[PDB]
């Protein structure tokens, strides 16, 4: 069904006109403690800001200002923290927020650099014997394991408290084949990536919500948290062909602006749930 509207806007060649009217009814929030003077080091992109109303707030006493939302979905009872990639002054945050929220996997949609440009800080050690302490939130991360696999590479991590002692397992997942340019041309190794995600139980409720970042926290990090809950819906409910991607997408973007970034971005959601809800049969 979901597959008829596909290939009727395929057909139709009215992808861009589908998503300008996404854009049009798309929330509008403030996010007036985003834009605080204070706050435009810790913001890598003027015109991606979390909403005041689901930001995620540090703890420390201080300044409690990362960009990050809470994308909390009611019906599929799942919870996401969508991120920017971390700048060379918030890798600190960053992990700061892992700990507090007690997450228990990090999903990482970029590379540290694409098109000749640095588009997230190296904000994990790439050596077991070369461990990175965060001074500024007192926070120790040390590389237990690593396995690079064609598409993606998963790695153990461990992150330590130092004003408690206190350590946690936190997984890795790195997916490493997003092409700079569009869109994958085959949507099956991104739902591959999907699954081991899951199969971890770093998505379960058990556990704080999953971070998931991009450069901007937005294009490819939406795709994945709507590929996810679309497909989670469609095994809830009594009447799978029920679920609305365009309605799922909107519900969403009540929590964080910009989710889905182009057409092409939109397209390929449609292809991930189409193919993955034939996997899952
Ligand atoms: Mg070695």
């Known amino acids: 069904?979901?597959?008829?509207?596909?290939?009727?806007?395929?057909?139709?060649?009215?992808?861009?006109?589908?998503?300008?009217?996404?854009?049009?009814?798309?929330?509008?929030?403030?996010?007036?403690?985003?834009?605080?003077?204070?706050?435009?080091?810790?913001?890598?992109?003027?015109?991606?800001?979390?909403?005041?109303?689901?930001?995620?707030?540090?703890?420390?006493?201080?300044?409690?200002?990362?960009?990050?939302?809470?994308?909390?979905?009611?019906?599929?009872?799942?919870?996401?923290?969508?991120?920017?990639?971390?700048?060379?002054?918030?890798?600190?945050?960053?992990?700061?927020?892992?700990?507090?929220?007690?997450?228990?996997?990090?999903?990482?949609?970029?590379?540290?650099?694409?098109?000749?440009?640095?588009?997230?800080?190296?904000?994990?050690?790439?050596?077991?014997?070369?461990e990175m302490i965060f001074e500024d939130t007192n926070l120790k991360l040390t590389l237990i394991s690593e396995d690079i696999k064609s598409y993606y590479t998963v790695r153990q991590l461990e992150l330590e408290n130092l004003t408690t002692q206190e350590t946690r397992e936190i997984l890795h997942f790195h997916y490493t084949t997003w092409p700079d340019f569009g869109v994958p041309e085959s949507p099956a190794s991104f739902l591959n990536f999907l699954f081991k995600v899951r199969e971890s139980g770093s998505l379960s409720p058990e556990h704080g919500p999953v971070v998931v970042h991009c450069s901007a926290g937005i294009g490819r990090s939406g795709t994945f948290c709507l590929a996810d809950t679309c497909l989670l819906l469609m095994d809830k409910r009594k009447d799978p062909s029920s679920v609305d991607i365009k309605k799922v997408l909107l519900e969403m973007r009540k929590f964080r602006m910009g989710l889905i970034q182009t057409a092409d971005q939109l397209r390929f959601s449609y292809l991930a749930v189409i193919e993955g809800a034939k996997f899952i049969m």
């Open 1 to 130: 069904e979901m597959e008829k509207e596909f290939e009727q806007i395929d057909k139709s060649g009215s992808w861009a006109a589908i998503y300008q009217d996404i854009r049009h009814e798309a929330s509008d929030f403030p996010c007036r403690v985003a834009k605080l003077p204070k706050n435009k080091n810790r913001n890598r992109y003027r015109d991606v800001s979390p909403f005041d109303h689901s930001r995620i707030k540090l703890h420390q006493e201080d300044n409690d200002y990362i960009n990050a939302s809470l994308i909390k979905m009611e019906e599929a009872q799942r919870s996401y923290i969508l991120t920017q990639g971390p700048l060379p002054n918030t890798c600190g945050h960053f992990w700061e927020m892992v700990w507090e929220q007690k997450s228990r996997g990090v999903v990482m949609l970029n590379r540290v650099m694409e098109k000749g440009s640095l588009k997230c800080a190296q904000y994990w050690p790439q050596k077991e014997e070369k």
